[model samples]
Target: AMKTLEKVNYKGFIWPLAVGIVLWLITPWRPGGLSVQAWEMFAIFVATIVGCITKPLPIGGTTLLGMVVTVLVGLAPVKDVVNSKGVVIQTGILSSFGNSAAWLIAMAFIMAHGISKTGLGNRVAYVMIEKFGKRSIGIGYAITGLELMMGALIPSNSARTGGVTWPVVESISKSYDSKPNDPSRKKIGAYLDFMAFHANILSTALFITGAAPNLVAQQMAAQKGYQMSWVSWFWAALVPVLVATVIIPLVIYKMYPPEVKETPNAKNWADDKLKEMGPISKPEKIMATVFCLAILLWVLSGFFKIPQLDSAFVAFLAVTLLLITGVLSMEDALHETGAWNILIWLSILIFMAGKLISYGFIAWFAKFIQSEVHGINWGLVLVVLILLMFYTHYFFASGTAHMTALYLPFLTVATAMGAPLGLSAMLLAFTGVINASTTHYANGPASILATTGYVKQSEWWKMNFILGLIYMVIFGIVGTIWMKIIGIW
Candidate 1:
């Protein structure tokens, strides 16, 4: 099987190279400095193929590789990529990774670590569940929704799940006859499992500070002058979807019911655990207070337009205060940071893609979009964007990769079509959330969490496809409605 897979992978690699080269050689669409453009396009094309075949390499990783080859191979100069000035005045965009997002990503992780360690996440979950869990007919769905809300503040969905809600819910699941691993044995039902990803989608969609890629999307938007805020963006992004899509999950539950018969409530056990942990330590107390203040600071950052102060800066501040107050140590903070390898990959990706945009290849490609999309209807253009996002995932696999590879180029196209930056920006950012419908492996956190014993690979693929269908419907309807409500349409 391994050998067969290897052979198939090689075939996939060669096919893109051969196809891109042949197309480049024959096409009339070649712009001046055409080779560089062709090179960048082909590199992205190949990366897309590789991601499809492999366990889906990090989207951001493949994008980095594409950028490196583009710049190093002279497809685009590093200086031009970094200086995106005058690329498109209409969009008001410039530079890929050299933007504010990289800094925001830095801030998000710092904030995320502090939120997870401080146990503030748990307290929030405890409070939400205490108030709302008993009020709903679908406690599982309600909890899932609540969990996703907590994730916005937490940033790392896995941390939000594994760190915050999982421990709380794990005890509850166990109380309801689960073996800690067996949602099936206890029959907690599909609502529990389904809500996990649902909450993930919510966080991924809702806010800039909520997920790492969200910041990436916003940065791309800002390059085009879409300068977004968490509050301003989510209004049109999430509200209409919420109103239009409430029935979608209910329909999904009926159609794709979990193997278990009923939902689980872990509140009693959660309370017991709280009792056991009794008298929240001074450390927990200080950390929790620091975390809440951090959140208040994050939301208010926009109001004051806090300069050089962002989620990462605040995250560091939170951590520093935690240590000074004796809440968590330097080692504790270091240990909780998820996989240093990802940070390296992200930085490398930024450096590489930065070169592509700076070198003029992105603008050169943008020029093509300028010619092609002129006079196109914005609505049709949006449909194309959503379709490209959905289909791109079948190839690229990683949401960030798909965003990085195409964002600026697409922004360039939208500018040519005469759409405002807000419309273009929202569309660009929405691409990341739409991608969650692609596959179980569309994201790292989802893939990693799904791999746990609860669901088999085959089962995940099958159900996830069905889930994707439902998601597209919900997202398309809600997204259109929300965007229109926001006046983007």
Candidate 2:
């Protein structure tokens, strides 16, 4: 128990804790049928969100702290309850454990574990470098493309970027004397580091299974009677995501150019490394095979009408095949912390957020906003909410937390204003993950990306703002046009 205190950031913990205290102490107000119960619970959720953003403690600790208050106050239903859809929503945090979105995310981590354990991730990393690692522009595009491919299979940005992608970039960084700083840092390491990070976020939006928060947004959409099969999300995001994909690296290159634009040595170094690793092993082949098969199933399931072959079901099947084939061991499946950490913290947020809506607070809040914005065109309201949703990430530490706190409210407001369900949900859904680039703290990978000394905090924020505007134009402006062209929304 005492050990936990050593890790506590007291300065960090204080403000978030203060917000919790202040909210709980505030007198419960009911304006036009808002219940004291709902208001009190909403206060707890607000505090939880503040804690998540400031991260006084690890998110799980912060989430559990808030959950403890709910349990202490008798906020849970105490027994299973049936919702209007004839589904039994279980009580306690266990109710969230049943959330399929949460399961899909957990399974995604294990799938990543397979790629890393079998060395396929690194193998592919080398291949990309060999093919496109010859120049500054080539290196940026190489890693970006590599990340895009892996991002499809590996949802955890930290695992994919930090574990597989960044290490390769780091070696390349060191090779060019871009190890820490200089002229050296700004010359190359800085640009590639930032490039890899940007590509990671874009891939997160490009694939439905690309980021954990993407699933959270999808589930939130499901709650609102909208769904995006794997295929639709991939297709919808392709143009906008690729548009940014093509542009971001070049602009960052322009803004943050490398001292050595043509990197023949880098490719030679990668070729040497590839030869050092030799041919791929059986496990690498197995992991590669399984990953492709899983992806094929994910894509095919969307077109097919089999309810039994949905994304998560196929993922579980992939895990089963990997374990049975000895590609991933019992220890790999049982000992992976990334999946469980996300499952624990994310599940709680899902539960609390689910409760927030089920208890009717979210709808009530929507009503409050609707009355205020009554008679405004839905499209205008959507535009405001879209920019609002994306830019709000400065205050958020986790994409999951940001989406959890605000998605349903925003969706309800837009839908209440008569916007089509798919348009609002998809746009905001895209926003939830895409907005993670606004600040270093906005998403899982950015936190890791920010501190490597390649990109200073100030420079990070500066580039972030510029890139954010660029994205807002791409996904925000061009993306909407493409969606209309496809006639999807």
Candidate 3:
């Protein structure tokens, strides 16, 4: 027990608690204003976010700790009810387990694991490359497109790119004699790697089901009464997707030109690789069927009022099918750490954010921000918010953390400034996703692609700055206009 307790990293852990204590001390009570408990809860909530950012332990561990601390210390109430029969009922700290968004993301993670276990994700990559790998530019676009295709199927960008895609990509580069340690990296390998990294960011922004953070953002929007469904997220982002996903690869081609522009044997190499994997296995067939069913149900849930069918239900069904078909074992489903981690942290964060709303914290903060931007033109305010949101990724290491900390509050400010609900919400959501592209430390895929030894540290930063600037310009101007034309404004 002593050794287990000692394993905790107290260094990073202390800051969040210290910050919370400081806030608790400084914050005072007033009639018709925040009470001691509300202030205390807010302090702990901020500290929880800070702890997540600092990562003193696994996010699940920190969030679980935060949850227990909040309830034990009487931050959020644990109402105990005794009926005539004297049965006690109190959810207390376990309340977050009931969050719809948490359940959706958890099930989605399990489905993603099914895809990984079935090897269907790798097949998708190979088939894409086999179709379009002949030319170097085609290979670049193909690699980027692979992320787009798999984004919905596999929620974890690292699992898709790093686990499945990277080994094959590294092999392909070696075939082209483009090892990262040598000067030969200037060949197609570095460009492919760069596209893979940046495209993960773009793809995440394109679909609501693409990343775990996307689901959290959706939940936050709904909590604020700015509801966005799967279809709305997809339709709102359609134009942005084309520009960012399809056209941007061409932009990258010109900006970061690969030396090996023509790869005639690449297709043959992909073909041989596919052959080595053998025919489509039974597991792949089942996984593919489940994938299609999930997409169909999620898209149709928007149009049809099915009584019990929601996105989360569809995701749960898919995961169940994966187990029934033996695509993923019961042990594998239980043991997918990312699923449980996101569930724990997201549930806690959602509960805290909801409490902030319940206790009027967000409204107060929004009003405070509104006062600061009161006299500014709403258009100008929107532009400023867009720029601020894009650039602030420099300070954040996790997209989810940044989105959790700032996305809703910023969206509130945007709405307060007279920005249209749909426009402000969608743009902010897209911004939350795309900011991951601004830095190698932004998220999992960013770190994975950056540390692969292909792109130099300086080169990675340079490319990030350049591509990031272009992405901002395109998304800001073109995205705003498109949203207006589509009547989202």
Question: In candidate 1, what are the lDDT values of residues 85-132, reduced to their tens digit?
Answer: 655321111244333333333334444555546565555555545554
Residue 91 local lDDT, model 2:
67
Clashing pairs in 2: none
**Whose lDDT is higher: candidate 1's or candidate 3's?**
3
Superior candidate under TM-score, 1 versus 3? 3
Q: Model 2, range 226-287, lDDT digits (tens) per residue?
A: 87789988888999988898888878888888777875665677788788888878888887
**What TM-score fits each model?**
0.59, 0.68, 0.63
Inter-residue clash pairs, candidate 3: none
How do the candidates rank by lDDT, highest first? Answer: 2, 3, 1
Task: Compose the digit string of candidate 3's lDDT tens values, residues 44-150.
Answer: 87787677656677567888888878888866655544566877433345666675555665576677667756777666655655777667777777666777887
Off by over 4 Å in 2: 1-7, 27-33, 77-90, 135-140, 143-243, 250-263, 305-308, 374-382, 388-470, 476-489
How does residue 21 of candidate 3 score in lDDT? 84
The number of clashing residue pairs in model 1 is 9
Query: Over 4 Å off in model 1, which ranges?
Result: 1-33, 37-45, 48-140, 143-239, 243-265, 337-339, 356-382, 389-489
Q: After superposition, how far is residue 266 of candidate 2 from its true place, in Å?
A: 2.0
Which has the greatest TM-score?
2
At residue 52, give the lDDT of candidate 2. Answer: 62
